[PDB]
PDB file of C-alpha atoms and ligand atoms in Angstrom:
ATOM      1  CA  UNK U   7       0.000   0.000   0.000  1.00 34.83           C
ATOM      2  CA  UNK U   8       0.593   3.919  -0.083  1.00 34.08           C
ATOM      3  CA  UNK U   9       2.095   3.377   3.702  1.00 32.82           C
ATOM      4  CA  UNK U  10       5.146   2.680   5.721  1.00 30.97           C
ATOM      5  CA  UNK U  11       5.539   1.413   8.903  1.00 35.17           C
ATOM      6  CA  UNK U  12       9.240   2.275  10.629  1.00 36.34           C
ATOM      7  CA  UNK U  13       9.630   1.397  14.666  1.00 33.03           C
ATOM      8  CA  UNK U  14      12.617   2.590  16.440  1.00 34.14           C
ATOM      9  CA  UNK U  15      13.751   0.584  19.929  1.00 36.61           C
ATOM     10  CA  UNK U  16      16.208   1.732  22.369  1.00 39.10           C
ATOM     11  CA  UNK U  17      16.291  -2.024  23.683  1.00 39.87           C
ATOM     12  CA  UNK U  18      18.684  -1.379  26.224  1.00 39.90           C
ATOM     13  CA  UNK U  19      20.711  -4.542  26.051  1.00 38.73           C
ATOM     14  CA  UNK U  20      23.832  -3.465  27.972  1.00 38.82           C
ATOM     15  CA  UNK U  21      26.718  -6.368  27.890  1.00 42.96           C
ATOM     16  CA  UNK U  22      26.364  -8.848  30.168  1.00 44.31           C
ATOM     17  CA  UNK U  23      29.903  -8.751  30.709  1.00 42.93           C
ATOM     18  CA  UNK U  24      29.423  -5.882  32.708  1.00 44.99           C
ATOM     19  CA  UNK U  25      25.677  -5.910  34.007  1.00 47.18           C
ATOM     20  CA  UNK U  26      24.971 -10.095  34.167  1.00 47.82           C
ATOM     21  CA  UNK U  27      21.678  -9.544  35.565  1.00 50.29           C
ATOM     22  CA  UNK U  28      19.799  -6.507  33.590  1.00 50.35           C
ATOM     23  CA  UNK U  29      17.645  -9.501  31.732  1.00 49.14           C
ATOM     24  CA  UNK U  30      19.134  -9.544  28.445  1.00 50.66           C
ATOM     25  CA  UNK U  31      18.645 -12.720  27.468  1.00 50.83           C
ATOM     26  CA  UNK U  32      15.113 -13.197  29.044  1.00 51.65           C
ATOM     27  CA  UNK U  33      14.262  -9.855  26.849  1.00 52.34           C
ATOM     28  CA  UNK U  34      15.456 -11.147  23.648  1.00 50.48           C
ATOM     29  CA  UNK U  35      12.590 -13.889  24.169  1.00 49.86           C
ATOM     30  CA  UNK U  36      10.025 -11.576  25.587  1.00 52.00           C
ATOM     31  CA  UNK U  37      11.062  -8.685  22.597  1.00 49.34           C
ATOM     32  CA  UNK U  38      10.999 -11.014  19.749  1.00 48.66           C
ATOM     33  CA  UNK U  39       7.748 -12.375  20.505  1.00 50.57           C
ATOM     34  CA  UNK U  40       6.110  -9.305  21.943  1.00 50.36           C
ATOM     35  CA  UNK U  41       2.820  -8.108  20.008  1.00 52.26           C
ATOM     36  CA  UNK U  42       4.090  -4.300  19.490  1.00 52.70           C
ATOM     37  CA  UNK U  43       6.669  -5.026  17.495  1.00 51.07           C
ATOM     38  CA  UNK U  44       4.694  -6.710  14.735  1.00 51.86           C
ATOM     39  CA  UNK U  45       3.212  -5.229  11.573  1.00 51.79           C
ATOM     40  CA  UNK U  46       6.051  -3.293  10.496  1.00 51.94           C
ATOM     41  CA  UNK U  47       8.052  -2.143   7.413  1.00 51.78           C
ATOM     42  CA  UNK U  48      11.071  -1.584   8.952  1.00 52.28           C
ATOM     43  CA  UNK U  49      12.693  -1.532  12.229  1.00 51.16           C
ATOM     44  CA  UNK U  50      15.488  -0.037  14.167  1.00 48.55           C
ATOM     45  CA  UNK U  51      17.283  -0.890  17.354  1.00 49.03           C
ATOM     46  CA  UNK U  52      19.202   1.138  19.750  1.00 50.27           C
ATOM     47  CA  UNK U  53      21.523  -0.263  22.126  1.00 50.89           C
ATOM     48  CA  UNK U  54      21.405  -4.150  21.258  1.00 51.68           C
ATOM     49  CA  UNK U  55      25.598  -3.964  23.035  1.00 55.59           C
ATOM     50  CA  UNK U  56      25.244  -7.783  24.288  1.00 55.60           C
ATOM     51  CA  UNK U  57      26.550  -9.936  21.450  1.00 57.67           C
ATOM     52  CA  UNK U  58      24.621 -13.382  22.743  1.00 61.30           C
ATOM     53  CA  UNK U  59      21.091 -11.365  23.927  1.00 61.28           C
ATOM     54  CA  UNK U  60      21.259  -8.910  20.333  1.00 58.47           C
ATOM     55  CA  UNK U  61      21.829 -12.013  18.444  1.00 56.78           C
ATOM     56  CA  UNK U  62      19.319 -13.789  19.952  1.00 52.65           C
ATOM     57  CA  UNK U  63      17.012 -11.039  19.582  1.00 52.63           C
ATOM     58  CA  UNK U  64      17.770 -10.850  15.947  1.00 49.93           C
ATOM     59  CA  UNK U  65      17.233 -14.199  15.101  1.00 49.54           C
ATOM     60  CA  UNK U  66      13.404 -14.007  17.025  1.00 48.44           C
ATOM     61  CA  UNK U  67      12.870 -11.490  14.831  1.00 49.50           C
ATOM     62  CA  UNK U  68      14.279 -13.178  11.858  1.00 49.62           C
ATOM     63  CA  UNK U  69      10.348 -14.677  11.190  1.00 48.61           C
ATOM     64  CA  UNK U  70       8.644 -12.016  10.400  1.00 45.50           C
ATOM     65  CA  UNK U  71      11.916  -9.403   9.532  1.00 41.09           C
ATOM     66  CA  UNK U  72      14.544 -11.775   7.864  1.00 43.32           C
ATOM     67  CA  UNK U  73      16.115  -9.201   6.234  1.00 45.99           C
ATOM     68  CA  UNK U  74      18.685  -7.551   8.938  1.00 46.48           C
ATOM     69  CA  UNK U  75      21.901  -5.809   8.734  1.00 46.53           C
ATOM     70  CA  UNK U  76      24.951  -6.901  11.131  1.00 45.36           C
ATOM     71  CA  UNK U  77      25.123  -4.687  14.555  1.00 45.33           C
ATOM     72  CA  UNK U  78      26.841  -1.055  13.989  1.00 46.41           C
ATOM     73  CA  UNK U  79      30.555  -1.338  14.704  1.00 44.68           C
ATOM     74  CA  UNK U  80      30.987  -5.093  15.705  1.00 42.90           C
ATOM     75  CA  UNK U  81      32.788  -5.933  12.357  1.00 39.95           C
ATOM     76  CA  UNK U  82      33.755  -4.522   9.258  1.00 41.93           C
ATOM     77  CA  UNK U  83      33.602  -7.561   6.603  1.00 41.86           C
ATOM     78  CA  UNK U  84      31.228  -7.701   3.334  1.00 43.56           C
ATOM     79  CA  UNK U  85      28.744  -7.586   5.623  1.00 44.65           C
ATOM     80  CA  UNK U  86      28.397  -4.253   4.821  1.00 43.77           C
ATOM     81  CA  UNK U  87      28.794  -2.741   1.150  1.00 43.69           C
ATOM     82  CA  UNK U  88      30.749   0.264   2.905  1.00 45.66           C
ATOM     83  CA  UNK U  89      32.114   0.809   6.589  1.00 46.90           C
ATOM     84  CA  UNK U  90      32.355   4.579   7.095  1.00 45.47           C
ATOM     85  CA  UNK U  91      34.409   7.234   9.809  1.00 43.92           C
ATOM     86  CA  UNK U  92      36.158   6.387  12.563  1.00 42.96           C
ATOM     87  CA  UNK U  93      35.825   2.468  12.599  1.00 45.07           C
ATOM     88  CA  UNK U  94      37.848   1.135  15.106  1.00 46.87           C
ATOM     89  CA  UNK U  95      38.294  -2.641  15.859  1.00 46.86           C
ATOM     90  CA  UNK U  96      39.976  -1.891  18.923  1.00 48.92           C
ATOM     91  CA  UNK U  97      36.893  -0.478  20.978  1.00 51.55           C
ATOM     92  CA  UNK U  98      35.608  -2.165  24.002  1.00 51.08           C
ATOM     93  CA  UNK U  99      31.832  -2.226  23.159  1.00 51.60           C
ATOM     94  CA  UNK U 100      29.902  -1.651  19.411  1.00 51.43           C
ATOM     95  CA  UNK U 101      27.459   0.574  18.277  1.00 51.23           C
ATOM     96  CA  UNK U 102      24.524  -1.226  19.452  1.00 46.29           C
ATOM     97  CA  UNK U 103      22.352  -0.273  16.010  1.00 44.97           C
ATOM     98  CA  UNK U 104      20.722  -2.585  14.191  1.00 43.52           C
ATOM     99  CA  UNK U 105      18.200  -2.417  11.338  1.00 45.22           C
ATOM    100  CA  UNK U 106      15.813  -5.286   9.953  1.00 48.19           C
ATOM    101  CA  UNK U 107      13.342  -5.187   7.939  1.00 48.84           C
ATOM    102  CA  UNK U 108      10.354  -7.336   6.281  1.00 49.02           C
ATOM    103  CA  UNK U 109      11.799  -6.113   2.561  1.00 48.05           C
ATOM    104  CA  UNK U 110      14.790  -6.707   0.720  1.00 44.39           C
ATOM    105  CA  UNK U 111      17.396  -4.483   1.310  1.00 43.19           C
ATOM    106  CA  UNK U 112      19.424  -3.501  -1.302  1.00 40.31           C
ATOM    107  CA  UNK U 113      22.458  -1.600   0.417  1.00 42.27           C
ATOM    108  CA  UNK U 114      24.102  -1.847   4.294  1.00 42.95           C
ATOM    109  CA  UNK U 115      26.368   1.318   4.974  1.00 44.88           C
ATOM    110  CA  UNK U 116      27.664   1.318   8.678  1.00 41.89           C
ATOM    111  CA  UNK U 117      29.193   5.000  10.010  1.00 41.66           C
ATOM    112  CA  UNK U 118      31.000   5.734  12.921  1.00 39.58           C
ATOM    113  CA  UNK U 119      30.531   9.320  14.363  1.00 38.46           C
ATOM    114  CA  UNK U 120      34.108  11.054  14.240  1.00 34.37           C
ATOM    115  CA  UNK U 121      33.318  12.956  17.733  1.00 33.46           C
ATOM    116  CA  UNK U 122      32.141  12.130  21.263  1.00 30.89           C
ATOM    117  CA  UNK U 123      32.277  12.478  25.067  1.00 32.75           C
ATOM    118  CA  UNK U 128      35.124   3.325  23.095  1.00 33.38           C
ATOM    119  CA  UNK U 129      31.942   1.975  21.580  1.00 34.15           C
ATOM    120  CA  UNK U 130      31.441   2.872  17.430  1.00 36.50           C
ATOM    121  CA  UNK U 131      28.949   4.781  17.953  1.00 35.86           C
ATOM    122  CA  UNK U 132      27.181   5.901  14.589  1.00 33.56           C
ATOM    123  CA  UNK U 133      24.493   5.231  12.098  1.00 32.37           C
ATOM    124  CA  UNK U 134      23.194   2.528  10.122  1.00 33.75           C
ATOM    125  CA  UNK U 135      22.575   3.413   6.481  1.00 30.64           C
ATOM    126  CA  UNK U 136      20.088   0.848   4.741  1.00 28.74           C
ATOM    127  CA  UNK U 137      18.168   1.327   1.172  1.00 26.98           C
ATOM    128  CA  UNK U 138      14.695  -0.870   0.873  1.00 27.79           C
ATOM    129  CA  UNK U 139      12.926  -1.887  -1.473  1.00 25.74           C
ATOM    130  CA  UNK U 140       9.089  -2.119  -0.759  1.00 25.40           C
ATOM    131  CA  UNK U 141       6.679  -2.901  -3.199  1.00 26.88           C
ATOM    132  CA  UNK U 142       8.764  -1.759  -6.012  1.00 26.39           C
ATOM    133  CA  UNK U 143       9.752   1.587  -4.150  1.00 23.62           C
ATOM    134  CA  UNK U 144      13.002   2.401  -2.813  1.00 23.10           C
ATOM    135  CA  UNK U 145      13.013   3.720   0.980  1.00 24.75           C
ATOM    136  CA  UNK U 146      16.419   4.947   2.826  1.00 23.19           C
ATOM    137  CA  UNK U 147      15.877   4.623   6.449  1.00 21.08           C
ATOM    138  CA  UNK U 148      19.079   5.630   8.698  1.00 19.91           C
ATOM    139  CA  UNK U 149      18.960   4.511  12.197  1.00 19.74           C
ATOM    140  CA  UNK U 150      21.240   6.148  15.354  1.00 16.07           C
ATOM    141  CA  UNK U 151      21.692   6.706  18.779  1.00 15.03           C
ATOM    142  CA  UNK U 152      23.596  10.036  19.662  1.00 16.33           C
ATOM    143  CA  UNK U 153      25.747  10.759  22.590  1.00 16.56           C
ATOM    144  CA  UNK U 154      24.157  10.604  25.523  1.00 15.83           C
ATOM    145  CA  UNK U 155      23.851  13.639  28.379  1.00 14.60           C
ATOM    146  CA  UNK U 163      29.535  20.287  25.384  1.00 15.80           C
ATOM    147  CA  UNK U 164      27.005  16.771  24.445  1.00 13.86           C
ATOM    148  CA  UNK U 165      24.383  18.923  22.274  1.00 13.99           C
ATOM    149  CA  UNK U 166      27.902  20.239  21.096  1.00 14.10           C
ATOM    150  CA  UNK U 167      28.735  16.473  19.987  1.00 14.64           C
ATOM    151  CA  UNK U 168      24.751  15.323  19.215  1.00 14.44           C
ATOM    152  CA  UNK U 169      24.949  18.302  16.667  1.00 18.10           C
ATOM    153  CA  UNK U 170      28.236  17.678  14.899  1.00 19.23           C
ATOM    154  CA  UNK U 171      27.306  13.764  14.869  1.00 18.31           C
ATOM    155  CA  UNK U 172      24.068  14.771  13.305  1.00 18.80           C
ATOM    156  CA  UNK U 173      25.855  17.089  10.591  1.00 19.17           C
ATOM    157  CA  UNK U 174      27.978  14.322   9.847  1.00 18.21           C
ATOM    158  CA  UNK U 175      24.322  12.112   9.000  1.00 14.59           C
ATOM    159  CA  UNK U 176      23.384  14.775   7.170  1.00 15.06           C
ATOM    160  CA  UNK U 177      26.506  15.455   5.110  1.00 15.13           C
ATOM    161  CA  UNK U 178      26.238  11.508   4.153  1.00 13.69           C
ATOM    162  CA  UNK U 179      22.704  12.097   3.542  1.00 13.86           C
ATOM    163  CA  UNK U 180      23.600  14.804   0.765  1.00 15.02           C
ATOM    164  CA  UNK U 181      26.677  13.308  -0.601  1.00 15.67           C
ATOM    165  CA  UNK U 182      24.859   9.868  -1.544  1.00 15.05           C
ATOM    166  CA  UNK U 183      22.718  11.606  -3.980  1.00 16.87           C
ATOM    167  CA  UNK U 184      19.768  10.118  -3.401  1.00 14.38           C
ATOM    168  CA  UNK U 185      16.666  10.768  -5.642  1.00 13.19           C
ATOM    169  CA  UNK U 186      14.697  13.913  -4.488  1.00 15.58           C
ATOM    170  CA  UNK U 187      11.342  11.662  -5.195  1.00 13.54           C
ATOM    171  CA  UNK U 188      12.604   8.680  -2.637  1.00 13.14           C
ATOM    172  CA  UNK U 189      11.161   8.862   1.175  1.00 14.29           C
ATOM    173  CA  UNK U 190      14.633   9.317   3.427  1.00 17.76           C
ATOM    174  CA  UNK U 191      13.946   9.003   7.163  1.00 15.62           C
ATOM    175  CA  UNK U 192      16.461   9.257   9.942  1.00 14.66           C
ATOM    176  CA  UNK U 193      15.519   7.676  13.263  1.00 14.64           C
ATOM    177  CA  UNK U 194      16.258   6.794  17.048  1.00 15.10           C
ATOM    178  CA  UNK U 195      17.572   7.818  20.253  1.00 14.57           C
ATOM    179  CA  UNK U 196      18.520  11.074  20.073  1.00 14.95           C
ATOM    180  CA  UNK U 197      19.129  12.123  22.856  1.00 15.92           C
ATOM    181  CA  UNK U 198      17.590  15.580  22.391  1.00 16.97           C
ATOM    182  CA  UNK U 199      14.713  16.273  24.459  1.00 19.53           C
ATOM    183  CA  UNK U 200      11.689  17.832  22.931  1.00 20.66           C
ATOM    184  CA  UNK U 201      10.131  18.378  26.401  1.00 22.65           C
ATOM    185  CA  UNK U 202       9.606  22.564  27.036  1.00 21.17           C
ATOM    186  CA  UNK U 203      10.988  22.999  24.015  1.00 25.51           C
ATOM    187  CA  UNK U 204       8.873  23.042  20.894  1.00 23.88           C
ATOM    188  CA  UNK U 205       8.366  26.958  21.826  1.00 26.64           C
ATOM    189  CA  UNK U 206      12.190  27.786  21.981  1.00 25.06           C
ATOM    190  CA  UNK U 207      13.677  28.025  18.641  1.00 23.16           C
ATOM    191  CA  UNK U 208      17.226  28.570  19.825  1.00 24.73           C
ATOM    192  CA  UNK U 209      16.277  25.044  21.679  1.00 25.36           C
ATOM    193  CA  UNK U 210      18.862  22.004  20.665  1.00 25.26           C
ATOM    194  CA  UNK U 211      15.147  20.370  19.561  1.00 28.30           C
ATOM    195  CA  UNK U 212      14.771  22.982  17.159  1.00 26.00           C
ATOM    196  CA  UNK U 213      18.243  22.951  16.048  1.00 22.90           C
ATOM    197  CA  UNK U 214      17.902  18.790  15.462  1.00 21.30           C
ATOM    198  CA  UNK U 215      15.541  19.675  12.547  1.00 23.34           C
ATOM    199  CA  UNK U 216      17.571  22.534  11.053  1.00 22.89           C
ATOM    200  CA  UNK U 217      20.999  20.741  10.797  1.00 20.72           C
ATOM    201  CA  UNK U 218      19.549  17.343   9.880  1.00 18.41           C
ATOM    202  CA  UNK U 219      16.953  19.529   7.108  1.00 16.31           C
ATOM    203  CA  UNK U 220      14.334  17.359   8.319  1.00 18.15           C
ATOM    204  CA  UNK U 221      10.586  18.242   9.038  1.00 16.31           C
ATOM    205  CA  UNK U 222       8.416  17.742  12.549  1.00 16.29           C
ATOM    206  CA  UNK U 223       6.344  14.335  12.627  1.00 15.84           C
ATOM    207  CA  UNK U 224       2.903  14.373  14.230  1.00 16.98           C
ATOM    208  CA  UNK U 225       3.111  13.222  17.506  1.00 16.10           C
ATOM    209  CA  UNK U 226       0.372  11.067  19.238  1.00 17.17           C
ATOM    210  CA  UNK U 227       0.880   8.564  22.145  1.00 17.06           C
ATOM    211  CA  UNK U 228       2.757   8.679  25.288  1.00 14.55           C
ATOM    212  CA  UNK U 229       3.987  12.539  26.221  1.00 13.51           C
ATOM    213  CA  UNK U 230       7.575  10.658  26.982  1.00 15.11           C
ATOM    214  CA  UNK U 231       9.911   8.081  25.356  1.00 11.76           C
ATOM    215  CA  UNK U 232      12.118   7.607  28.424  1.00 12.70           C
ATOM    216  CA  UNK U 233       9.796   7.815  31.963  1.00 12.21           C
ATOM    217  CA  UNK U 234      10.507   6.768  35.192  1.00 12.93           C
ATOM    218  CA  UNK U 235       7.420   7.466  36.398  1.00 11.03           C
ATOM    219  CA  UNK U 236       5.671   4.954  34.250  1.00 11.17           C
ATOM    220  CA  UNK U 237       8.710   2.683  33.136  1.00 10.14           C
ATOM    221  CA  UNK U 238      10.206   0.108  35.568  1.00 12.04           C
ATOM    222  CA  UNK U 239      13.331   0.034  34.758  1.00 13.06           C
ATOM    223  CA  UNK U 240      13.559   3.950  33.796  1.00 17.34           C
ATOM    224  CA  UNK U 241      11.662   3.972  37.731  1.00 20.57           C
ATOM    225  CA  UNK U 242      14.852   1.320  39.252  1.00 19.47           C
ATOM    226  CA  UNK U 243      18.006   3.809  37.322  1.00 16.43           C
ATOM    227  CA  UNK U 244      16.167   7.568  38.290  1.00 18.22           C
ATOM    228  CA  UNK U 245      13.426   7.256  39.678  1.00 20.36           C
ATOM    229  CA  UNK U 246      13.198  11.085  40.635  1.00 20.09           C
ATOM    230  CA  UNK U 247      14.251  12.048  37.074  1.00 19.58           C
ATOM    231  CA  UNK U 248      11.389  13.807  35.137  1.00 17.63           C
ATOM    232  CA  UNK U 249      10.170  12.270  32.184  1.00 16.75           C
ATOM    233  CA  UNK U 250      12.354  12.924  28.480  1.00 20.75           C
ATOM    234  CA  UNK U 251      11.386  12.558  25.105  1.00 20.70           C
ATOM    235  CA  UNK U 252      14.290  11.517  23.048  1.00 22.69           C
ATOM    236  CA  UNK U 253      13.408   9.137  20.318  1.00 24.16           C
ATOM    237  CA  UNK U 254      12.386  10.234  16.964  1.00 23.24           C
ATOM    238  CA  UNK U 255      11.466   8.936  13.126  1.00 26.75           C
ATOM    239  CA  UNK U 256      11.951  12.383  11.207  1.00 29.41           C
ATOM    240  CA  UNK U 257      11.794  12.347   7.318  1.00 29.77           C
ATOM    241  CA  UNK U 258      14.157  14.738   5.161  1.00 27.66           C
ATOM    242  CA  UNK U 259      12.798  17.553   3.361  1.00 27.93           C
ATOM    243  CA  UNK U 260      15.451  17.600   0.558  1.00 27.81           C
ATOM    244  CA  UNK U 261      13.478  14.330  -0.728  1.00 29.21           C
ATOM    245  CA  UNK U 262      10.288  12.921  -0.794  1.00 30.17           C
ATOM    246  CA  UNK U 263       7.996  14.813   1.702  1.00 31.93           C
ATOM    247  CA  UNK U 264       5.532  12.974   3.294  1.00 34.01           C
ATOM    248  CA  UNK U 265       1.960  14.159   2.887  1.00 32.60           C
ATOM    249  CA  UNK U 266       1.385  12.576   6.714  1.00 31.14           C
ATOM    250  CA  UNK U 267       4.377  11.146   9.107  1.00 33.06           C
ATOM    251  CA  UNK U 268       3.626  10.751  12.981  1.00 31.39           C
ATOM    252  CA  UNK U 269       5.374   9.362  15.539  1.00 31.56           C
ATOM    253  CA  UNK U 270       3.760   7.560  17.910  1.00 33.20           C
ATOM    254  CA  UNK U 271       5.220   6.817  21.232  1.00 30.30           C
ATOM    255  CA  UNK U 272       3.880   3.401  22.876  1.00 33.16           C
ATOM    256  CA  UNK U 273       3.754   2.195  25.978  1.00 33.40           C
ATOM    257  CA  UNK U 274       3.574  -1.652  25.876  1.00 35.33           C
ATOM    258  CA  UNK U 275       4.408  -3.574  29.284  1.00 38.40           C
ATOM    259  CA  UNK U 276       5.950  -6.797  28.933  1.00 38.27           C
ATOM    260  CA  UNK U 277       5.259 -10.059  30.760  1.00 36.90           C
ATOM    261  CA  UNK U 278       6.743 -10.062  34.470  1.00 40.99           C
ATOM    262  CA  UNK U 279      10.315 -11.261  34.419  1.00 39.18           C
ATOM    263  CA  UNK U 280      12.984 -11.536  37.595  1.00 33.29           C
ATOM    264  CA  UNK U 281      16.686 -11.077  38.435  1.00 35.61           C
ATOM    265  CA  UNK U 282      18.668 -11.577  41.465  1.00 34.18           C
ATOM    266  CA  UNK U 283      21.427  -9.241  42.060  1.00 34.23           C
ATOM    267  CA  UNK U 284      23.178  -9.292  45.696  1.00 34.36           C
ATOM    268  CA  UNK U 285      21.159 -12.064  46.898  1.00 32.89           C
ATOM    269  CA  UNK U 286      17.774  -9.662  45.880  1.00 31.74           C
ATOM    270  CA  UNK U 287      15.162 -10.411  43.375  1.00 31.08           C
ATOM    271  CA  UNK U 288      14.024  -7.537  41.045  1.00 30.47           C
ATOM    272  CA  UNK U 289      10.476  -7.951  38.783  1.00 30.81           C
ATOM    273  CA  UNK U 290       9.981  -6.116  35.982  1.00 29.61           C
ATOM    274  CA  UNK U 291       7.509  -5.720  33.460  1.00 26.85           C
ATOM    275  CA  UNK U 292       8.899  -3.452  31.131  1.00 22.09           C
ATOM    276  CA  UNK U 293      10.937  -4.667  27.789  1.00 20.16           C
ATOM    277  CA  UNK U 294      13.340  -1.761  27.996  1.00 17.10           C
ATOM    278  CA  UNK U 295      13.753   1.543  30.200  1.00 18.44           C
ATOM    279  CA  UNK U 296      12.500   3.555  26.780  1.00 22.95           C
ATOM    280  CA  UNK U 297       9.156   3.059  25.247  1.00 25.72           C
ATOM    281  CA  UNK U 298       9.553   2.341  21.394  1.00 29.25           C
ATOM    282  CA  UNK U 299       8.016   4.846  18.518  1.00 30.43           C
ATOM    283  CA  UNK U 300       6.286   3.932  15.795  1.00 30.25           C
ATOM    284  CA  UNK U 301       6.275   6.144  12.584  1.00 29.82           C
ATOM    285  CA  UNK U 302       2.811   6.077  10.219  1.00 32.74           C
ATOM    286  CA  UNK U 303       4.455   7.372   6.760  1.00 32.61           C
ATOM    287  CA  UNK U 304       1.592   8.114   3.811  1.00 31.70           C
ATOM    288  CA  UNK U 305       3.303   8.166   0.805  1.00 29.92           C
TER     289      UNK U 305
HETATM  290 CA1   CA Z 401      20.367   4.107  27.713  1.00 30.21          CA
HETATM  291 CA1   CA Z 402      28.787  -5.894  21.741  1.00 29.96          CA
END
């Protein structure tokens, strides 16, 4: 149909090497056969760091999405058709960025950011073919909370790839993740780093329905267990360029699905949760 479907996941799978007991592979299970993250065209993930749980995760999601690039930064073979910036196989941890998909994609570019505050942090490049239409969907995580200094010269560097690919001006290019800007008190302030998001990446302002937050510890258990007296952010987005194909309608919802209880023990304490990660995952209605 005349629609696309993109979801973007901040998953938080943190290595087990260093957290053992944050549920990783317990969340693979309950992620890959969770009901939210059905029905879609495409779909990104943020922060799938454990090698075992993120390719466990990927292969429950092989089903329904078989097509799936490797995991940002964890390798630079033919895997991908190009492996961009500051690559380094040296790093401790990956990228974490992942992008799979129900269609057949047709090119894998991996990029890692030149600038920030260890782990290949970056952007996964992908071009899709659905129903005999080419989509470019770009998936990220910025540097985390000088950092809007470093969020804005990693997104420059998206959008200088972005304009140097030379992508058709009639193809759909959308750019999505975590952020790490908050839009929160400040959709009013155009000197904001929100407002500045859309300016350097020359992207235009989805609809927004759902949840009023992406990451909230007052309604997320795990985002409740890390902060619980931090307020509420909104940093994950699904944002279309406007020097292509402009979508007639693009929203971004934010969901809030709650997962089935799970349980850790940690220093001879059990924890329950019932949350699949400490962000809530967007998904991104695209007429076109
Ligand atoms: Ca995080
Ligand atoms: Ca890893």
């Amino acid at each position: 149909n005349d629609t696309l479907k993109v979801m973007t996941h901040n998953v938080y799978m943190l290595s087990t090497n260093l957290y053992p007991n944050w549920g990783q592979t317990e969340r693979a299970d309950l992620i890959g056969a969770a009901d939210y993250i059905k029905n879609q065209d495409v779909v990104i993930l943020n922060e799938v760091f454990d090698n075992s749980a993120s390719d466990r995760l990927l292969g429950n999601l092989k089903k329904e999405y078989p097509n799936q690039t490797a995991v940002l930064g964890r390798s630079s073979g033919s895997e991908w058709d190009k492996t961009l910036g500051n690559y380094s196989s040296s790093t401790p941890e990956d990228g974490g960025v992942a992008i799979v998909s129900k269609w057949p994609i047709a090119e894998k570019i991996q990029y890692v950011f030149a600038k920030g505050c260890l782990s290949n942090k970056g952007f996964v490049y992908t071009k899709i073919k659905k129903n005999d239409r080419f989509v470019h969907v770009i998936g990220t995580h910025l540097q985390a909370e000088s950092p809007a200094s470093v969020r804005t010269n990693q997104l420059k560097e998206i959008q200088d790839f972005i304009k140097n690919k030379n992508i058709p001006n009639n193809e759909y290019v959308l750019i999505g993740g975590d952020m790490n800007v908050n839009k929160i008190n400040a959709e009013n302030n155009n000197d904001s780093e929100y407002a500045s998001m859309f300016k350097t990446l020359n992207a235009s302002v989805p609809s927004y329905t759902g949840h009023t937050a992406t990451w909230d510890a007052t309604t997320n258990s795990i985002a409740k267990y890390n902060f619980p007296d931090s307020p509420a952010e909104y940093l994950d987005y699904i944002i279309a360029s406007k020097d292509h194909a402009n979508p007639s309608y693009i929203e971004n919802k934010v969901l809030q699905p709650k997962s089935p209880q799970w349980t850790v023990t940690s220093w001879f304490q059990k924890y329950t949760y019932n949350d699949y990660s400490d962000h809530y995952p967007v998904e991104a209605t695209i007429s076109m």
